[PDB]
Design a protein around this ligand. Structure first.
Ligand SMILES: OC[C@@H]1O[C@@H](O[C@@H]2[C@@H](O)[C@H](O[C@@H]3CO[C@@H](O[C@@H]4CO[C@@H](O)[C@H](O)[C@H]4O)[C@H](O)[C@H]3O)OC[C@H]2O[C@@H]2OC[C@@H](O)[C@H](O)[C@H]2O)[C@H](O)[C@H]1O
Ligand SMILES: [Cl-]
Ligand SMILES: [Cl-]
Ligand SMILES: [Cl-]
Ligand SMILES: [Cl-]
Ligand SMILES: [Cl-]
Ligand SMILES: [Cl-]
Ligand SMILES: [Cl-]
Ligand SMILES: [Cl-]
Ligand SMILES: [Cl-]
Ligand SMILES: [Cl-]
Ligand SMILES: [Cl-]
Ligand SMILES: [Cl-]
Ligand SMILES: [Cl-]
Ligand SMILES: [Cl-]
Ligand SMILES: [Cl-]
Ligand SMILES: [Cl-]
Ligand SMILES: [Cl-]
Ligand SMILES: [Cl-]
Ligand code: NA
Length: 194
């Protein structure tokens, strides 16, 4: 295993990984065999970390494990596009704070119903540095840790609702995120191209 406490991307046991923190509190990620990783955080600022793929795409993502936020955290299939720059989230779990914004309708996927939202961040950290970009969200109506995420179901619903993705030129990870919170996660990802 490899313990990560510093911003970086790379490959571990056949999976891409990304770790980003604003540097608040205490945040680590442990990289284990295959698609396994855990995180531990105490009074974080903001972080996003997980395993997945160097480029996004239509993928039947399978994951399992545990996600235990004390306060604000997200469990999401997470990544980015270029042209346009979009930060996208398919959220299966959260803590005290449910992501919201401009409501666009619902999509049904992997045994659940998801609420679709768009938000915008101005001059914020991104995979292209300080940038303005839209965020696309699918938020499950009931919390869970584990199952299939059919990314194609979400991408197609976003497209019907006028939320067009750019090119899958950046990573797509099964992410743990925290905001001014504590917690842990212990997750395994895999998944094949649909
Ligand atoms: O990973 C090693 C580092 O890469 C270089 O710096 C930049 C990375 O920090 C950046 O990472 C992004 C930053 O944004 C994160 O998304 C945040 C997370 O919270 C969300 O809720 C919020 O909306 C959002 O703002 C995202 O998770 C991270 O993946 O990736 C880009 C990188 O900068 C680029 O480096 C290459 C260069 O060609 C570009 O000009 C430059 O912008 C550092 O070198 C190193 O620390
Ligand atoms: Cl490190
Ligand atoms: Cl590496
Ligand atoms: Cl390795
Ligand atoms: Cl590897
Ligand atoms: Cl990959
Ligand atoms: Cl859990
Ligand atoms: Cl709304
Ligand atoms: Cl809108
Ligand atoms: Cl609807
Ligand atoms: Cl549901
Ligand atoms: Cl907004
Ligand atoms: Cl944000
Ligand atoms: Cl827009
Ligand atoms: Cl629930
Ligand atoms: Cl759970
Ligand atoms: Cl499922
Ligand atoms: Cl593409
Ligand atoms: Cl990337
Ligand atoms: Na749009």
């Amino acid at each position: 295993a490899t313990v990560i406490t510093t911003n970086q991307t790379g490959t571990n046991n056949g999976f891409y990984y990304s770790f980003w923190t604003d540097g608040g509190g205490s945040v680590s990620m442990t990289l284990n065999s295959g698609g396994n990783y855990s995180t531990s955080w105490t009074n974080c600022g903001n972080f996003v970390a997980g395993k997945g793929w160097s480029n996004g795409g239509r993928r039947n993502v399978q994951y399992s494990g545990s996600f235990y936020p004390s306060g604000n955290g997200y469990l999401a299939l997470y990544g980015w596009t270029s042209n346009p720059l979009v930060e996208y989230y398919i959220v299966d779990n959260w803590g005290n704070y449910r992501p919201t914004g401009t409501y666009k309708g619902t999509v049904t996927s992997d045994g659940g119903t998801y609420d679709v939202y768009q938000t915008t961040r101005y001059n914020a950290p991104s995979v292209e540095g300080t940038k303005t970009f839209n965020q696309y969200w699918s938020v499950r109506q009931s919390k869970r840790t584990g199952g299939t995420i059919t990314t194609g179901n979400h991408f197609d619903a976003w497209a019907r609702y006028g939320m067009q993705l750019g090119s899958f030129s950046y990573y797509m990870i099964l992410a743990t995120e925290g905001y001014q919170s504590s917690g842990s996660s212990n997750l395994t990802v895999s998944g094949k191209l649909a």
